Structures are given as C-alpha cells and as structure tokens.
Amino acid sequence: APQQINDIVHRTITPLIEQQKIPGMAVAVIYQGKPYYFTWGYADIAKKQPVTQQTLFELGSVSKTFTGVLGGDAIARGEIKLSDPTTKYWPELTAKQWNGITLLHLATYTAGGLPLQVPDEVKSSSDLLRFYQNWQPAWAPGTQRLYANSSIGLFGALAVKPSGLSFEQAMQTRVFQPLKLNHTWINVPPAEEKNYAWGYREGKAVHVSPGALDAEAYGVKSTIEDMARWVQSNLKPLDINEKTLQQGIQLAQSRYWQTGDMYQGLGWEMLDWPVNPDSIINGSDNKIALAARPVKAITPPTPAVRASWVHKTGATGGFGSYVAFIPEKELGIVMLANKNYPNPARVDAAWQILNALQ
Numbered sequence: 001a002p003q004q005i006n007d008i009v010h011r012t013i014t015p016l017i018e019q020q021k022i023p024g025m026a027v028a029v030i031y032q033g034k035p036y037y038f039t040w041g042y043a044d045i046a047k048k049q050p051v052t053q054q055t056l057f058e059l060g061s062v063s064k065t066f067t068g069v070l071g072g073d074a075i076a077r078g079e080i081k082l083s084d085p086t087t088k089y090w091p092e093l094t095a096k097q098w099n100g101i102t103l104l105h106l107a108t109y110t111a112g113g114l115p116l117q118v119p120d121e122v123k124s125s126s127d128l129l130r131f132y133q134n135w136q137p138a139w140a141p142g143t144q145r146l147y148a149n150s151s152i153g154l155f156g157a158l159a160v161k162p163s164g165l166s167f168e169q170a171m172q173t174r175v176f177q178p179l180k181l182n183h184t185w186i187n188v189p190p191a192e193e194k195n196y197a198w199g200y201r202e203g204k205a206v207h208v209s210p211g212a213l214d215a216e217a218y219g220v221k222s223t224i225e226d227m228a229r230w231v232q233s234n235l236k237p238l239d240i241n242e243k244t245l246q247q248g249i250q251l252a253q254s255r256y257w258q259t260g261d262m263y264q265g266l267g268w269e270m271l272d273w274p275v276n277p278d279s280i281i282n283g284s285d286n287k288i289a290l291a292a293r294p295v296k297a298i299t300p301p302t303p304a305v306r307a308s309w310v311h312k313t314g315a316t317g318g319f320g321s322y323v324a325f326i327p328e329k330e331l332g333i334v335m336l337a338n339k340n341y342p343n344p345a346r347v348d349a350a351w352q353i354l355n356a357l358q
C-alpha cells in the first residue's frame, strides 16, 4: 500500500486499539476504487489465532444495509412497492392500527414507535404475529423516527414473500452471489467455523445469540475482503451487471426522510459532503442514534446523491463495526473489530483517515 495510506492508517488505528483495548481488528481503505487491507491482533485470544483477511466478523446492524438493498432489488423486480400497505403482504395483520403503515414506514423506522428490540419471548411465527397485532403505536406513521430492529426486520421478512424464497435464500441468490461475496453468511457453515472470530464482552468470548428477525436485522457475518467489495459495489452501482441489483443499490441510497442534517435511506444513512465531523461523530453516540426524532419527508425522495457521506454502524454483544464511503471521491473505509467500543471513536477514526486522503 502507498506509504501515504499506510501511514494515515497506522497513525490512527494503533492508538484506537490501545485506548479501547480492542483484541482484533481488520480495516480496509478503498482508495480510487482499489482496496488496501490492514490487520491487527487476535480473532481468538485463547488459541492465539490472528486476524487475517479471511477472519469472519459479526456485522451487527451493518446487516441492515444488505436488507435495504435486497428490498431495493425486490422493488426493481416489481415484486413489491414501498407505497404498499403492510397488510398487503401479511393479510393476517388485522389490527386497525396497521391501516396506513406502508413498507416505506417499516424500512425507515417511521411506522410510529415500533420497538428497538423484538422481545426475547417472541419465538414462533405465531408469537411474532401476536406481538405486532398487540403493538400500540405512539405516533402517526411518517412523523417520528425511532431506530428499530422490529421495524426494518419486518420489512426484510415481508419484502421476500412474493419471491417464494426464504430470506437467507434470497439474500444469497440475489445479493451475495451476484456480487461475489463468497465469504458472507447469515448462518456460518461448519467448513467456515475455524475463521469465525470470537466477540469479546467484559473479557468473555461471545457470539451473537439467536433471535426473532435476527437474519433480517443484525445477522450477517463477513470478512474484510467481502466488505470491501460490498463498499465498492455501493460506491459505483452503475458498474454492477445485474439490472435490478444496480437499481436496488441506488434506491437504498435515496433520501426518504431528513432529521437534523441526516438523511434516511434503506438501511444506509447519509449526510451531505463535505460534512462537519461533529455532525456525524456526535450523532453516532447511542444516546442520539437511538432516540425519538421528528422527521421531514422528502417528497419525492432524492436519488442517490454522489456528494454524500454514506455510512452505518453495527454492533452485537462482542463486535463493533463501521462502514463509510464518499461516492464522489471513490473513497471508503471498513472497520471490523471483535469488541463493541464507542461509536464516536469509530466515526472519529474513519473521518481522520478519509479526510486525509481528500
């Protein structure tokens, strides 16, 4: 890697790993379309296994960007419409409160207060239906944004219904394979287990626990190499061969709502570039990223804007991830760690590196 990139990276990530006590980390910088990889520490502290370009990390909510694009591809295929009522895909949703709640509200967290987490008690499809049927909205649809797994999770489950394929099946065949993400999984197979890094929470080795709508909201596991291709694909969608996937990517980066100087896409979140580091950095803290915030609809949605800072944070009990890219500069970064450390720290490091490369 050019000495320039190599220096900016090590000068920034080294103290980060030290301050945050991160056991292992993988970083990919996409500069002028080409990726450069950096690895540090352990994937397994006990067995002294190093982090490599083949190590699998839990992406946590970065998975939502995959769900948004899969949803965007289904729209391009004409299988679903974001303007459709949710009941069109789940007729059993009889509760009257589901009246004017569209797939758009679900995908963008603007349904009216759906909870951040689906209760652990919800284990069956019947449990899920009861949960949603009994849910009492706090606000009218399209008025407030409340980051929620139960919102985008449902959007993912419903978006694949017409296709007759399971969520994992549709993700693999419509997104993973066409993009050559051959080491990206929802369920890591035995053959890949040895590359599955351990997450660390308070010194204990952990992996994400099974849960309702986990695949759809936070279940993807991937390597730094596949994540770099993921970013390349989102930077230059017009270079993707699949027509509907190319369109789906563009739809996920469109701006449907605005809150502060942040815009909500499908999974992805955007800000105008150049961007005030404080705007992102401070907005990341899980005290502002999860809170209730009024939204302004952008009617009609603005098509993917090249001059944007597109990103998404993700975390599970033992992993912390972050992705950010600027289409206009063909610049991007991916940071995967097996320790869930503060979001502001992630955004700060990402900004420093990316700002330095223009």
Ligand SMILES: *[B]([O])([O])C1=[C]C([N+](=O)[O-])=[C][C]=[C]1
Residues within 6 Å of the ligand: 059, 060, 061, 062, 116, 149, 208, 218, 313, 314, 315, 316, 317
């Ligand atoms: B995402 O990482 O913000 C996220 C993830 C989970 N999870 O359990 O993995 C819950 C809420 C948000």
